[PDB]
Amino acid sequence: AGTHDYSTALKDSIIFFDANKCGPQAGENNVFDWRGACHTTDGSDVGVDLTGGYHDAGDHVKFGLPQGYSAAILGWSLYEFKESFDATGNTTKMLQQLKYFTDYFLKSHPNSTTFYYQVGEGNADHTYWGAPEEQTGQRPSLYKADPSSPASDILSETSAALTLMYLNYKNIDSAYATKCLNAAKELYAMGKANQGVGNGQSFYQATSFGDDLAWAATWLYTATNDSTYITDAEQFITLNKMQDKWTMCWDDMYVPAALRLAQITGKQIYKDAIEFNFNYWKTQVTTTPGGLKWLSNWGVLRYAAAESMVMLVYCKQNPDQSLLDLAKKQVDYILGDNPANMSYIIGYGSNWCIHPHHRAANGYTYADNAKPAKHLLTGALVGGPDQNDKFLDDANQYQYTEVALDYNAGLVGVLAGAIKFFG
Ligand SMILES: [Ca+2]
Ligand code: NI
Ligand SMILES: [Zn+2]
């Protein structure tokens, strides 16, 4: 299409998070009238209030790595493209989504050396299909990080999310912002003190933490101007990921970390890492007949949006028309410029997905979970099509209909960037 409404898509992509809010206050200032208080006793098994935060995807477990990653990427979006949010009147709502994340992180850090990062057990949670408000019983505070239990990647992403909140909220509530920075410093300290990846069951199997430590370190530098953090960062990022053939996602933050280090240190090694990844996506990554960069089969649009966001952040200082064109094509494809003639953002554009893999939106139980979703899950980015640009909008095809926090995190960022460069 000659013109696209990036403004409305941005608003919708932010609104999506309201559908996954968890806790006694989940329904407060929530755009969806079908969402209410849920899992109000989280943390009761360990004597700590662990309510709040967000359900991970179509399920209700709160997984630490994607929870932290999502909060960090959303915070990065606001930090780099603030003008886009202000101009479209989305800053207020965005800040509310972010504070819902940070309030949860702070409550999950009872003392300086402890951090609870998973509420719920994946296997059991998935045997349930119904509204989160009616899921009773006891959820276990399954995992926590402490001096004897490492979770460097989770702790670092959470630290980055908290530091970004300090940067994005200091002008609104400096006291709360500082509380976030102090917590961010402590979580980072925990992460480098005992090194190793955190636990995510078989659902979120992590493979690297050096990328996260480096990433968290660059933000602490931006907030404190303390060079020691960069000394740490240069060491952690090298723990060959300098030739990353993947992209930014919950498990791999090597590209974003390299981008910030190139900006902060000016070293060629980091500039080369970014150039490699970008050039790899330009010609090596599979391209569907429809023009979509297809990295892998699961959450394919999530990957295209994430890489595009990184390229747009890079373009702020180093405008490269080849990058802007690539990024714009991926975004436009998601919005409706594709062989399937459908918007991949539910509730936006035309002929959107009617079978999202989301319990709350579905609205049925085991009496009809195969019927079309009863409620409109506005703003959700679905898994996406196959390498032939085909989309199967039906009940059991999860690869196509899955939705998740980490999927939308990158979408918000790229849309904010699109408004700046093409808006
Ligand atoms: Ca990692
Ligand atoms: Ni178009
Ligand atoms: Zn809940």
Residues in the chain: 423
Q: How far apart are CA 359 and CA 373, in angstroms?
A: 9
Minimal CA–CA distance to 300: which of 382, 379, 397, 358? Answer: 382
Under 8 Å between Cβ of 225 and 180: no
**Ligand 2 centroid vs 134 CA: distance in angstroms?**
42
Domain boundaries, the chain: 1-423
Q: Is 293 helix (H, G, I), strand (E, B) or coil?
A: strand
CA distance readout (Å), 361 to 82, 130, 308: 30, 10, 28
CATH architecture of 1-423: Alpha/alpha barrel (1.50)
The token pair at 119 is 């509420």
Burial of 149 from C-beta contacts in 10 A (0-12 / 13-18 / 19+): middle
Under 8 Å between Cβ of 81 and 168: no
**Ligand 2 centroid vs 4 CA: distance in angstroms?**
6
Under 8 Å between Cβ of 339 and 290: yes
**Angle at which helices 210-224 and 174-193 cross, to 10°:** 140
Partner residues linked to 345 by β-bridges: 381
CA distance readout (Å), 119 to 40, 54, 72: 12, 10, 19
Q: How far apart are CA 118 and CA 120, in angstroms?
A: 6
Instruction: Tell me, yes or no, if 173 is annotated catalytic.
Output: no
**Ligand 3 centroid vs 96 CA: distance in angstroms?**
17
- Residues by chain with Cβ below 5 Å of ion ligand 3: 22, 38-39, 132
Minimal CA–CA distance to 248: which of 322, 160, 184? Answer: 160
What are the phi and psi torsion angles at 145 (to 5°)? -105, 140
Q: Identify how many contiguous H helices and E strands the chain contains and give both numbers.
A: 16, 3
What are the phi and psi torsion angles at 48 (to 5°)? -135, 135
Tokens 């990353």 label which residue? 244
Instruction: Tell me, yes or no, if 86 is annotated catalytic.
Output: no
Beta-carbon contacts of 150 under 8 Å, excluding residues fewer than 6 positions away, are 191, 194, 195, 196, 197, 198
First to last CA, the chain: 14
Which of the following is catalytic: 12, 125, 402, 406? 402
**Angle at which helices 405-421 and 64-80 cross, to 10°:** 10
Under 8 Å between Cβ of 10 and 419: yes
Breaks in the chain, named by the residue before each, with C–N above 2.5 Å? 239, 367
DSSP assignment of 20-57: GB-BTTTTTT-S-TT---B-TTTTTTTTS----SB--S
Q: Which amino acid is at 48?
A: V
